[PDB]
C-alpha cells in the first residue's frame, strides 16, 4: 500500500508557511486583514531647510 | 518644506543683545557708566 511519503510527495492538503523578508509564501491571515484595508497616503515630511535623509 | 530660526524655536539669535545691568538685575554695561567709569 502506498501514500504520499512513500513516492516522495506533498500530501493531498498540506502548507507551505508564511513568506518572509527573504522567503515566499502565503500570506499570515493578519498581512490579509491588513492589505485590503490598507491606504495610500503616508504623509510626513518631506524636506527641512534645504536638506533630506 | 518648513524653515525654522532661533526665533521660530525659542531660542537667542547668534546676533543678540542683552537687557542692560540695573541695581536690581544684571546684564549688559550701560553707556553711560562705561564713560564714567573711564573718566574717573
Redesign the interface.
Given at each position: 500500500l502506498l501514500d504520499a511519503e512513500d513516492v516522495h510527495a506533498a500530501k493531498k492538503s498540506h502548507t507551505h508557511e508564511v513568506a518572509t523578508y527573504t522567503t515566499d509564501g502565503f500570506m499570515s491571515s493578519f498581512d490579509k486583514q491588513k492589505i485590503d484595508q490598507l491606504v495610500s497616503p503616508e504623509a510626513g515630511?518631506?524636506?527641512?531647510?534645504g536638506k533630506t535623509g | 518644506?518648513?524653515?525654522?530660526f532661533a526665533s521660530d524655536l525659542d531660542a537667542a539669535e547668534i546676533n543678540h543683545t542683552h537687557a542692560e545691568a540695573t541695581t536690581t538685575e544684571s546684564g549688559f554695561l550701560s553707556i553711560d557708566d562705561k564713560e564714567k567709569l573711564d573718566a574717573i
Open positions: 515630511v518631506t524636506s527641512i531647510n | 518644506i518648513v524653515d525654522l
